[PDB]
């Protein structure tokens, strides 16, 4: 029993982490086969980040200007190109520790693990969600750019995030491993406010089911509700609409607990309207929305 925010084991990703320096900026790169992926603002000085012409800055750079280090060992760069907001550095040595891997672009509300790095060296791993406004609430310091987010199926690593930017409000923005940003953000130091965020309703419900499985049951009321009536109340508290697809995803958790999804919705309605009255659920005093139905199944019935 018990329930915690759990990341995937990072080992397979740790063996891919390298350090990339170009002139004076230093950050993290991802080494798969004979290519190193990193954020293109490795070629930016602090000055020209306010509005950079990436094409103009890159043309002045040689292969030899890219200093790529895998621990101690230097890696000779023999080619470079720019794909959207990432750089692909071809090296003459393929990473012997390359796992089986995919590149995927995830959906708002999905979760993944982050291996935060500095100077190519992993420092910690944590779990977070892609917010509905396409930010992530990470923990990042300066030089963390190039850290990646991922999921691990069985032996296969699905890379879904590379870190680029910190927004003035303290949330973070990045790309998939093809260099396309999530949401309307750019790797320019200008004004770019996040959209207003919302709560990931399907995740809150999954976390309520996890509570029941572990034995926190005090919030279960005796009522039921329609999907439309639930979505009217969820709208008012800034919750994402719940769809029949979300209801279908919650099915196994419903079967395991004996509680129909619309019944759990009625219980969550009451929590929304009345609050928690100073009680806790799975050790938390607020409604947690960064556990997907799959994270709940992985940790409870697994």
PDB file of C-alpha atoms in Angstrom:
ATOM      1  CA  UNK A   1       0.000   0.000   0.000  1.00  0.00           C
ATOM      2  CA  UNK A   2       0.877   3.695   0.021  1.00  0.00           C
ATOM      3  CA  UNK A   3       0.904   6.225  -2.815  1.00  0.00           C
ATOM      4  CA  UNK A   4       3.655   8.568  -3.961  1.00  0.00           C
ATOM      5  CA  UNK A   5       4.749  10.628  -6.919  1.00  0.00           C
ATOM      6  CA  UNK A   6       7.008   8.123  -8.660  1.00  0.00           C
ATOM      7  CA  UNK A   7       9.375   8.755 -11.552  1.00  0.00           C
ATOM      8  CA  UNK A   8      10.590   6.120 -13.972  1.00  0.00           C
ATOM      9  CA  UNK A   9      14.084   4.736 -13.321  1.00  0.00           C
ATOM     10  CA  UNK A  10      16.394   7.198 -15.057  1.00  0.00           C
ATOM     11  CA  UNK A  11      19.352   4.880 -15.775  1.00  0.00           C
ATOM     12  CA  UNK A  12      18.662   4.441 -19.498  1.00  0.00           C
ATOM     13  CA  UNK A  13      18.511   8.229 -19.955  1.00  0.00           C
ATOM     14  CA  UNK A  14      21.547   8.981 -17.716  1.00  0.00           C
ATOM     15  CA  UNK A  15      23.791   7.107 -20.153  1.00  0.00           C
ATOM     16  CA  UNK A  16      22.700   9.466 -22.951  1.00  0.00           C
ATOM     17  CA  UNK A  17      23.437  12.739 -21.172  1.00  0.00           C
ATOM     18  CA  UNK A  18      26.330  14.828 -22.534  1.00  0.00           C
ATOM     19  CA  UNK A  19      27.621  18.389 -22.068  1.00  0.00           C
ATOM     20  CA  UNK A  20      27.633  20.804 -25.054  1.00  0.00           C
ATOM     21  CA  UNK A  21      29.567  24.089 -25.203  1.00  0.00           C
ATOM     22  CA  UNK A  22      29.625  26.573 -28.072  1.00  0.00           C
ATOM     23  CA  UNK A  23      31.793  29.562 -27.398  1.00  0.00           C
ATOM     24  CA  UNK A  24      30.758  30.335 -23.866  1.00  0.00           C
ATOM     25  CA  UNK A  25      27.282  28.974 -23.180  1.00  0.00           C
ATOM     26  CA  UNK A  26      27.295  25.457 -21.744  1.00  0.00           C
ATOM     27  CA  UNK A  27      24.280  23.147 -21.472  1.00  0.00           C
ATOM     28  CA  UNK A  28      23.053  19.557 -21.780  1.00  0.00           C
ATOM     29  CA  UNK A  29      22.717  17.337 -24.843  1.00  0.00           C
ATOM     30  CA  UNK A  30      21.077  13.996 -25.619  1.00  0.00           C
ATOM     31  CA  UNK A  31      23.404  11.505 -27.351  1.00  0.00           C
ATOM     32  CA  UNK A  32      21.624   8.804 -29.409  1.00  0.00           C
ATOM     33  CA  UNK A  33      23.604   6.749 -31.978  1.00  0.00           C
ATOM     34  CA  UNK A  34      25.933   9.325 -33.626  1.00  0.00           C
ATOM     35  CA  UNK A  35      23.782  12.429 -33.044  1.00  0.00           C
ATOM     36  CA  UNK A  36      23.667  14.830 -30.093  1.00  0.00           C
ATOM     37  CA  UNK A  37      20.457  16.849 -29.725  1.00  0.00           C
ATOM     38  CA  UNK A  38      20.561  20.091 -27.766  1.00  0.00           C
ATOM     39  CA  UNK A  39      18.760  23.441 -27.588  1.00  0.00           C
ATOM     40  CA  UNK A  40      19.898  25.853 -30.270  1.00  0.00           C
ATOM     41  CA  UNK A  41      20.358  28.671 -27.831  1.00  0.00           C
ATOM     42  CA  UNK A  42      23.736  27.032 -26.986  1.00  0.00           C
ATOM     43  CA  UNK A  43      25.040  29.462 -29.653  1.00  0.00           C
ATOM     44  CA  UNK A  44      23.529  32.518 -27.931  1.00  0.00           C
ATOM     45  CA  UNK A  45      25.422  34.745 -25.582  1.00  0.00           C
ATOM     46  CA  UNK A  46      23.531  36.394 -22.737  1.00  0.00           C
ATOM     47  CA  UNK A  47      23.293  39.640 -24.764  1.00  0.00           C
ATOM     48  CA  UNK A  48      21.662  38.416 -27.965  1.00  0.00           C
ATOM     49  CA  UNK A  49      18.982  36.302 -26.269  1.00  0.00           C
ATOM     50  CA  UNK A  50      16.569  39.274 -26.154  1.00  0.00           C
ATOM     51  CA  UNK A  51      15.967  38.802 -29.917  1.00  0.00           C
ATOM     52  CA  UNK A  52      18.304  36.315 -31.682  1.00  0.00           C
ATOM     53  CA  UNK A  53      18.709  35.597 -35.390  1.00  0.00           C
ATOM     54  CA  UNK A  54      19.532  31.909 -35.027  1.00  0.00           C
ATOM     55  CA  UNK A  55      20.380  31.419 -38.698  1.00  0.00           C
ATOM     56  CA  UNK A  56      22.835  34.330 -38.648  1.00  0.00           C
ATOM     57  CA  UNK A  57      24.479  33.118 -35.423  1.00  0.00           C
ATOM     58  CA  UNK A  58      24.741  29.501 -36.601  1.00  0.00           C
ATOM     59  CA  UNK A  59      26.377  30.272 -39.962  1.00  0.00           C
ATOM     60  CA  UNK A  60      29.380  31.748 -38.106  1.00  0.00           C
ATOM     61  CA  UNK A  61      29.947  28.389 -36.315  1.00  0.00           C
ATOM     62  CA  UNK A  62      32.165  25.469 -37.313  1.00  0.00           C
ATOM     63  CA  UNK A  63      31.920  21.824 -36.278  1.00  0.00           C
ATOM     64  CA  UNK A  64      35.058  22.492 -34.246  1.00  0.00           C
ATOM     65  CA  UNK A  65      33.282  25.287 -32.327  1.00  0.00           C
ATOM     66  CA  UNK A  66      31.067  22.612 -30.714  1.00  0.00           C
ATOM     67  CA  UNK A  67      32.733  21.152 -27.617  1.00  0.00           C
ATOM     68  CA  UNK A  68      30.864  17.936 -26.764  1.00  0.00           C
ATOM     69  CA  UNK A  69      31.926  15.982 -23.681  1.00  0.00           C
ATOM     70  CA  UNK A  70      30.674  12.607 -22.459  1.00  0.00           C
ATOM     71  CA  UNK A  71      32.028  12.721 -18.936  1.00  0.00           C
ATOM     72  CA  UNK A  72      35.759  13.114 -19.354  1.00  0.00           C
ATOM     73  CA  UNK A  73      35.861  11.999 -23.004  1.00  0.00           C
ATOM     74  CA  UNK A  74      35.515  14.573 -25.769  1.00  0.00           C
ATOM     75  CA  UNK A  75      33.388  13.707 -28.819  1.00  0.00           C
ATOM     76  CA  UNK A  76      34.517  14.930 -32.225  1.00  0.00           C
ATOM     77  CA  UNK A  77      31.782  16.814 -34.080  1.00  0.00           C
ATOM     78  CA  UNK A  78      31.750  16.037 -37.813  1.00  0.00           C
ATOM     79  CA  UNK A  79      28.491  17.779 -38.770  1.00  0.00           C
ATOM     80  CA  UNK A  80      25.769  20.083 -37.553  1.00  0.00           C
ATOM     81  CA  UNK A  81      22.304  21.241 -38.565  1.00  0.00           C
ATOM     82  CA  UNK A  82      19.322  23.050 -37.069  1.00  0.00           C
ATOM     83  CA  UNK A  83      15.886  21.394 -36.879  1.00  0.00           C
ATOM     84  CA  UNK A  84      13.308  23.880 -35.569  1.00  0.00           C
ATOM     85  CA  UNK A  85      14.516  24.862 -32.081  1.00  0.00           C
ATOM     86  CA  UNK A  86      17.090  22.062 -31.582  1.00  0.00           C
ATOM     87  CA  UNK A  87      20.559  21.399 -32.973  1.00  0.00           C
ATOM     88  CA  UNK A  88      21.619  17.988 -34.251  1.00  0.00           C
ATOM     89  CA  UNK A  89      25.344  17.461 -33.736  1.00  0.00           C
ATOM     90  CA  UNK A  90      26.661  14.470 -35.660  1.00  0.00           C
ATOM     91  CA  UNK A  91      29.613  12.932 -33.830  1.00  0.00           C
ATOM     92  CA  UNK A  92      32.084  10.324 -35.069  1.00  0.00           C
ATOM     93  CA  UNK A  93      31.249   7.915 -32.183  1.00  0.00           C
ATOM     94  CA  UNK A  94      27.886   6.269 -31.536  1.00  0.00           C
ATOM     95  CA  UNK A  95      26.760   6.095 -27.927  1.00  0.00           C
ATOM     96  CA  UNK A  96      27.373   2.507 -26.762  1.00  0.00           C
ATOM     97  CA  UNK A  97      24.664   3.023 -24.101  1.00  0.00           C
ATOM     98  CA  UNK A  98      21.876   3.968 -26.561  1.00  0.00           C
ATOM     99  CA  UNK A  99      18.626   2.370 -25.356  1.00  0.00           C
ATOM    100  CA  UNK A 100      15.719   1.414 -27.525  1.00  0.00           C
ATOM    101  CA  UNK A 101      13.960   4.751 -27.956  1.00  0.00           C
ATOM    102  CA  UNK A 102      11.141   6.721 -29.588  1.00  0.00           C
ATOM    103  CA  UNK A 103      10.406  10.410 -30.070  1.00  0.00           C
ATOM    104  CA  UNK A 104       6.826  11.266 -29.116  1.00  0.00           C
ATOM    105  CA  UNK A 105       4.822  14.463 -28.686  1.00  0.00           C
ATOM    106  CA  UNK A 106       2.515  14.235 -25.704  1.00  0.00           C
ATOM    107  CA  UNK A 107      -0.890  15.719 -24.948  1.00  0.00           C
ATOM    108  CA  UNK A 108      -1.783  18.216 -22.215  1.00  0.00           C
ATOM    109  CA  UNK A 109      -2.617  16.308 -19.053  1.00  0.00           C
ATOM    110  CA  UNK A 110      -0.098  13.535 -19.705  1.00  0.00           C
ATOM    111  CA  UNK A 111       2.731  13.029 -17.205  1.00  0.00           C
ATOM    112  CA  UNK A 112       6.428  12.248 -17.659  1.00  0.00           C
ATOM    113  CA  UNK A 113       9.673  12.097 -15.688  1.00  0.00           C
ATOM    114  CA  UNK A 114      12.395  14.757 -15.852  1.00  0.00           C
ATOM    115  CA  UNK A 115      16.100  14.051 -15.407  1.00  0.00           C
ATOM    116  CA  UNK A 116      17.520  17.468 -14.517  1.00  0.00           C
ATOM    117  CA  UNK A 117      21.133  17.941 -15.602  1.00  0.00           C
ATOM    118  CA  UNK A 118      23.973  20.438 -15.185  1.00  0.00           C
ATOM    119  CA  UNK A 119      27.145  20.318 -17.288  1.00  0.00           C
ATOM    120  CA  UNK A 120      26.012  16.965 -18.698  1.00  0.00           C
ATOM    121  CA  UNK A 121      25.762  15.423 -15.246  1.00  0.00           C
ATOM    122  CA  UNK A 122      22.388  14.171 -13.921  1.00  0.00           C
ATOM    123  CA  UNK A 123      21.416  15.637 -10.545  1.00  0.00           C
ATOM    124  CA  UNK A 124      17.870  14.497  -9.855  1.00  0.00           C
ATOM    125  CA  UNK A 125      14.703  12.999 -11.274  1.00  0.00           C
ATOM    126  CA  UNK A 126      11.115  14.086 -10.679  1.00  0.00           C
ATOM    127  CA  UNK A 127       7.667  13.615 -12.162  1.00  0.00           C
ATOM    128  CA  UNK A 128       5.384  16.288 -13.614  1.00  0.00           C
ATOM    129  CA  UNK A 129       2.529  16.865 -16.055  1.00  0.00           C
ATOM    130  CA  UNK A 130       2.105  18.815 -19.269  1.00  0.00           C
ATOM    131  CA  UNK A 131      -0.231  21.584 -18.155  1.00  0.00           C
ATOM    132  CA  UNK A 132      -3.332  22.424 -20.223  1.00  0.00           C
ATOM    133  CA  UNK A 133      -1.635  25.761 -21.024  1.00  0.00           C
ATOM    134  CA  UNK A 134       1.426  23.837 -22.289  1.00  0.00           C
ATOM    135  CA  UNK A 135       3.789  24.893 -19.495  1.00  0.00           C
ATOM    136  CA  UNK A 136       5.303  22.529 -16.953  1.00  0.00           C
ATOM    137  CA  UNK A 137       5.856  23.280 -13.276  1.00  0.00           C
ATOM    138  CA  UNK A 138       9.391  21.967 -12.980  1.00  0.00           C
ATOM    139  CA  UNK A 139      12.383  22.609 -10.737  1.00  0.00           C
ATOM    140  CA  UNK A 140      15.124  24.090 -12.940  1.00  0.00           C
ATOM    141  CA  UNK A 141      18.180  26.254 -12.327  1.00  0.00           C
ATOM    142  CA  UNK A 142      20.452  28.018 -14.810  1.00  0.00           C
ATOM    143  CA  UNK A 143      22.196  25.613 -17.173  1.00  0.00           C
ATOM    144  CA  UNK A 144      19.447  22.985 -16.941  1.00  0.00           C
ATOM    145  CA  UNK A 145      18.547  23.551 -20.617  1.00  0.00           C
ATOM    146  CA  UNK A 146      18.849  20.295 -22.536  1.00  0.00           C
ATOM    147  CA  UNK A 147      17.418  18.171 -19.733  1.00  0.00           C
ATOM    148  CA  UNK A 148      14.756  15.835 -21.115  1.00  0.00           C
ATOM    149  CA  UNK A 149      11.423  14.386 -20.069  1.00  0.00           C
ATOM    150  CA  UNK A 150      10.513  10.817 -20.883  1.00  0.00           C
ATOM    151  CA  UNK A 151       8.388   7.757 -20.296  1.00  0.00           C
ATOM    152  CA  UNK A 152       9.634   4.167 -20.197  1.00  0.00           C
ATOM    153  CA  UNK A 153       7.314   1.462 -21.561  1.00  0.00           C
ATOM    154  CA  UNK A 154       9.311  -1.748 -21.002  1.00  0.00           C
ATOM    155  CA  UNK A 155      12.871  -1.371 -22.306  1.00  0.00           C
ATOM    156  CA  UNK A 156      11.881   1.475 -24.642  1.00  0.00           C
ATOM    157  CA  UNK A 157      12.415   5.139 -23.747  1.00  0.00           C
ATOM    158  CA  UNK A 158       9.846   7.572 -25.160  1.00  0.00           C
ATOM    159  CA  UNK A 159      11.487  11.001 -25.150  1.00  0.00           C
ATOM    160  CA  UNK A 160       8.817  13.718 -25.046  1.00  0.00           C
ATOM    161  CA  UNK A 161      10.389  16.913 -23.682  1.00  0.00           C
ATOM    162  CA  UNK A 162      13.582  18.954 -23.899  1.00  0.00           C
ATOM    163  CA  UNK A 163      14.011  21.927 -21.591  1.00  0.00           C
ATOM    164  CA  UNK A 164      14.625  25.405 -23.078  1.00  0.00           C
ATOM    165  CA  UNK A 165      13.085  28.379 -21.213  1.00  0.00           C
ATOM    166  CA  UNK A 166      11.944  29.766 -17.874  1.00  0.00           C
ATOM    167  CA  UNK A 167       9.053  32.205 -18.148  1.00  0.00           C
ATOM    168  CA  UNK A 168       8.893  35.387 -15.984  1.00  0.00           C
ATOM    169  CA  UNK A 169       6.219  33.680 -13.873  1.00  0.00           C
ATOM    170  CA  UNK A 170       8.561  30.832 -12.943  1.00  0.00           C
ATOM    171  CA  UNK A 171       7.042  28.033 -15.038  1.00  0.00           C
ATOM    172  CA  UNK A 172       8.937  26.305 -17.807  1.00  0.00           C
ATOM    173  CA  UNK A 173       8.632  25.805 -21.539  1.00  0.00           C
ATOM    174  CA  UNK A 174      10.284  23.452 -23.991  1.00  0.00           C
ATOM    175  CA  UNK A 175      10.048  21.359 -27.129  1.00  0.00           C
ATOM    176  CA  UNK A 176       9.604  17.807 -28.284  1.00  0.00           C
ATOM    177  CA  UNK A 177      12.743  16.103 -29.635  1.00  0.00           C
ATOM    178  CA  UNK A 178      12.019  17.498 -33.101  1.00  0.00           C
ATOM    179  CA  UNK A 179      12.513  20.992 -31.699  1.00  0.00           C
ATOM    180  CA  UNK A 180       8.893  22.189 -31.891  1.00  0.00           C
ATOM    181  CA  UNK A 181       7.777  24.098 -28.791  1.00  0.00           C
ATOM    182  CA  UNK A 182       4.795  22.990 -26.752  1.00  0.00           C
ATOM    183  CA  UNK A 183       2.283  25.820 -26.909  1.00  0.00           C
ATOM    184  CA  UNK A 184       2.844  29.318 -28.264  1.00  0.00           C
ATOM    185  CA  UNK A 185       6.289  29.831 -26.738  1.00  0.00           C
ATOM    186  CA  UNK A 186       9.615  30.763 -28.352  1.00  0.00           C
ATOM    187  CA  UNK A 187      13.297  30.649 -27.400  1.00  0.00           C
ATOM    188  CA  UNK A 188      13.394  34.463 -27.284  1.00  0.00           C
ATOM    189  CA  UNK A 189      13.737  36.424 -24.036  1.00  0.00           C
ATOM    190  CA  UNK A 190      10.675  38.608 -24.559  1.00  0.00           C
ATOM    191  CA  UNK A 191       7.157  38.876 -23.155  1.00  0.00           C
ATOM    192  CA  UNK A 192       5.231  35.633 -23.456  1.00  0.00           C
ATOM    193  CA  UNK A 193       2.615  35.017 -20.810  1.00  0.00           C
ATOM    194  CA  UNK A 194       1.229  31.555 -20.280  1.00  0.00           C
ATOM    195  CA  UNK A 195      -2.456  31.097 -20.865  1.00  0.00           C
ATOM    196  CA  UNK A 196      -4.585  30.700 -17.773  1.00  0.00           C
ATOM    197  CA  UNK A 197      -4.128  27.163 -16.511  1.00  0.00           C
ATOM    198  CA  UNK A 198      -6.897  24.711 -15.625  1.00  0.00           C
ATOM    199  CA  UNK A 199      -7.163  21.588 -13.488  1.00  0.00           C
ATOM    200  CA  UNK A 200      -6.865  18.196 -15.217  1.00  0.00           C
ATOM    201  CA  UNK A 201     -10.221  16.737 -14.180  1.00  0.00           C
ATOM    202  CA  UNK A 202      -9.604  13.159 -15.404  1.00  0.00           C
ATOM    203  CA  UNK A 203      -6.408  13.063 -13.319  1.00  0.00           C
ATOM    204  CA  UNK A 204      -8.157  14.295 -10.154  1.00  0.00           C
ATOM    205  CA  UNK A 205     -10.707  11.487 -10.569  1.00  0.00           C
ATOM    206  CA  UNK A 206      -7.938   8.910 -11.052  1.00  0.00           C
ATOM    207  CA  UNK A 207      -6.305  10.180  -7.845  1.00  0.00           C
ATOM    208  CA  UNK A 208      -9.637   9.901  -6.021  1.00  0.00           C
ATOM    209  CA  UNK A 209      -9.860   6.264  -7.156  1.00  0.00           C
ATOM    210  CA  UNK A 210      -6.296   5.731  -5.885  1.00  0.00           C
ATOM    211  CA  UNK A 211      -7.402   7.082  -2.496  1.00  0.00           C
ATOM    212  CA  UNK A 212     -10.274   4.578  -2.251  1.00  0.00           C
ATOM    213  CA  UNK A 213      -7.924   1.705  -3.163  1.00  0.00           C
ATOM    214  CA  UNK A 214      -5.557   2.743  -0.372  1.00  0.00           C
ATOM    215  CA  UNK A 215      -8.419   3.252   2.099  1.00  0.00           C
ATOM    216  CA  UNK A 216      -9.186   7.017   2.147  1.00  0.00           C
ATOM    217  CA  UNK A 217     -12.924   6.854   1.650  1.00  0.00           C
ATOM    218  CA  UNK A 218     -14.467   9.665   3.745  1.00  0.00           C
ATOM    219  CA  UNK A 219     -15.267  11.856   0.704  1.00  0.00           C
ATOM    220  CA  UNK A 220     -17.588   9.299  -0.968  1.00  0.00           C
ATOM    221  CA  UNK A 221     -21.139  10.692  -0.888  1.00  0.00           C
ATOM    222  CA  UNK A 222     -24.369   8.801  -1.557  1.00  0.00           C
ATOM    223  CA  UNK A 223     -25.310  10.732  -4.721  1.00  0.00           C
ATOM    224  CA  UNK A 224     -24.805  10.414  -8.475  1.00  0.00           C
ATOM    225  CA  UNK A 225     -24.820  12.948 -11.314  1.00  0.00           C
ATOM    226  CA  UNK A 226     -25.088  13.311 -15.073  1.00  0.00           C
ATOM    227  CA  UNK A 227     -22.025  14.137 -17.152  1.00  0.00           C
ATOM    228  CA  UNK A 228     -23.554  17.463 -18.236  1.00  0.00           C
ATOM    229  CA  UNK A 229     -24.384  18.530 -14.683  1.00  0.00           C
ATOM    230  CA  UNK A 230     -20.869  17.551 -13.592  1.00  0.00           C
ATOM    231  CA  UNK A 231     -19.328  19.642 -16.380  1.00  0.00           C
ATOM    232  CA  UNK A 232     -21.444  22.667 -15.373  1.00  0.00           C
ATOM    233  CA  UNK A 233     -19.948  22.567 -11.878  1.00  0.00           C
ATOM    234  CA  UNK A 234     -16.428  21.782 -13.165  1.00  0.00           C
ATOM    235  CA  UNK A 235     -16.591  24.777 -15.502  1.00  0.00           C
ATOM    236  CA  UNK A 236     -17.202  27.085 -12.546  1.00  0.00           C
ATOM    237  CA  UNK A 237     -14.103  25.946 -10.620  1.00  0.00           C
ATOM    238  CA  UNK A 238     -11.770  26.163 -13.646  1.00  0.00           C
ATOM    239  CA  UNK A 239     -11.678  22.424 -14.301  1.00  0.00           C
ATOM    240  CA  UNK A 240     -11.210  20.949 -17.771  1.00  0.00           C
ATOM    241  CA  UNK A 241     -14.368  19.443 -19.289  1.00  0.00           C
ATOM    242  CA  UNK A 242     -14.734  15.707 -18.730  1.00  0.00           C
ATOM    243  CA  UNK A 243     -15.447  13.761 -21.936  1.00  0.00           C
ATOM    244  CA  UNK A 244     -16.729  10.259 -22.649  1.00  0.00           C
ATOM    245  CA  UNK A 245     -13.155   9.349 -23.632  1.00  0.00           C
ATOM    246  CA  UNK A 246     -12.046  10.329 -20.125  1.00  0.00           C
ATOM    247  CA  UNK A 247     -14.920   8.249 -18.730  1.00  0.00           C
ATOM    248  CA  UNK A 248     -13.756   5.275 -20.823  1.00  0.00           C
ATOM    249  CA  UNK A 249     -10.177   5.649 -19.639  1.00  0.00           C
ATOM    250  CA  UNK A 250     -11.383   5.580 -16.019  1.00  0.00           C
ATOM    251  CA  UNK A 251     -13.153   2.248 -16.628  1.00  0.00           C
ATOM    252  CA  UNK A 252     -10.669  -0.193 -15.062  1.00  0.00           C
ATOM    253  CA  UNK A 253     -10.428   1.939 -11.951  1.00  0.00           C
ATOM    254  CA  UNK A 254     -14.217   1.971 -11.788  1.00  0.00           C
ATOM    255  CA  UNK A 255     -14.369  -1.827 -12.114  1.00  0.00           C
ATOM    256  CA  UNK A 256     -11.633  -2.350  -9.500  1.00  0.00           C
ATOM    257  CA  UNK A 257     -13.436  -0.196  -6.900  1.00  0.00           C
ATOM    258  CA  UNK A 258     -17.102  -0.823  -7.715  1.00  0.00           C
ATOM    259  CA  UNK A 259     -17.769   2.929  -8.121  1.00  0.00           C
ATOM    260  CA  UNK A 260     -19.232   4.208 -11.399  1.00  0.00           C
ATOM    261  CA  UNK A 261     -17.407   7.235 -12.842  1.00  0.00           C
ATOM    262  CA  UNK A 262     -20.494   9.452 -12.618  1.00  0.00           C
ATOM    263  CA  UNK A 263     -20.785   8.463  -8.940  1.00  0.00           C
ATOM    264  CA  UNK A 264     -17.203   9.516  -8.275  1.00  0.00           C
ATOM    265  CA  UNK A 265     -18.044  12.707 -10.181  1.00  0.00           C
ATOM    266  CA  UNK A 266     -20.815  13.463  -7.678  1.00  0.00           C
ATOM    267  CA  UNK A 267     -18.336  13.035  -4.819  1.00  0.00           C
ATOM    268  CA  UNK A 268     -15.896  15.390  -6.548  1.00  0.00           C
ATOM    269  CA  UNK A 269     -18.678  17.914  -7.175  1.00  0.00           C
ATOM    270  CA  UNK A 270     -19.301  18.102  -3.430  1.00  0.00           C
ATOM    271  CA  UNK A 271     -15.574  18.496  -2.718  1.00  0.00           C
ATOM    272  CA  UNK A 272     -15.536  21.356  -5.220  1.00  0.00           C
ATOM    273  CA  UNK A 273     -18.537  23.129  -3.675  1.00  0.00           C
ATOM    274  CA  UNK A 274     -17.809  22.491   0.053  1.00  0.00           C
ATOM    275  CA  UNK A 275     -14.034  22.086   0.264  1.00  0.00           C
ATOM    276  CA  UNK A 276     -12.209  19.529   2.372  1.00  0.00           C
ATOM    277  CA  UNK A 277     -13.034  21.000   5.853  1.00  0.00           C
ATOM    278  CA  UNK A 278      -9.402  20.658   6.934  1.00  0.00           C
ATOM    279  CA  UNK A 279      -9.124  16.960   6.051  1.00  0.00           C
ATOM    280  CA  UNK A 280      -6.530  15.292   3.812  1.00  0.00           C
ATOM    281  CA  UNK A 281      -6.654  12.793   0.916  1.00  0.00           C
ATOM    282  CA  UNK A 282      -3.598  10.565   0.302  1.00  0.00           C
ATOM    283  CA  UNK A 283      -1.663  12.924   2.565  1.00  0.00           C
ATOM    284  CA  UNK A 284      -2.654  16.025   0.579  1.00  0.00           C
ATOM    285  CA  UNK A 285      -4.861  18.904   1.649  1.00  0.00           C
ATOM    286  CA  UNK A 286      -5.813  19.842  -1.918  1.00  0.00           C
ATOM    287  CA  UNK A 287      -6.967  17.969  -5.005  1.00  0.00           C
ATOM    288  CA  UNK A 288      -3.964  16.594  -6.939  1.00  0.00           C
ATOM    289  CA  UNK A 289      -4.117  16.550 -10.727  1.00  0.00           C
ATOM    290  CA  UNK A 290      -0.735  15.190 -11.924  1.00  0.00           C
ATOM    291  CA  UNK A 291      -1.535  11.450 -11.735  1.00  0.00           C
ATOM    292  CA  UNK A 292      -3.042   9.971 -14.883  1.00  0.00           C
ATOM    293  CA  UNK A 293      -5.297   6.887 -14.776  1.00  0.00           C
ATOM    294  CA  UNK A 294      -2.278   4.943 -16.030  1.00  0.00           C
ATOM    295  CA  UNK A 295      -0.057   6.235 -13.198  1.00  0.00           C
ATOM    296  CA  UNK A 296      -2.721   5.062 -10.720  1.00  0.00           C
ATOM    297  CA  UNK A 297      -2.965   1.555 -12.234  1.00  0.00           C
ATOM    298  CA  UNK A 298       0.830   1.260 -12.404  1.00  0.00           C
ATOM    299  CA  UNK A 299       1.260   1.946  -8.702  1.00  0.00           C
ATOM    300  CA  UNK A 300      -1.877   0.369  -7.173  1.00  0.00           C
ATOM    301  CA  UNK A 301      -2.812  -2.842  -8.973  1.00  0.00           C
ATOM    302  CA  UNK A 302       0.702  -3.446 -10.381  1.00  0.00           C
TER     303      UNK A 302
END
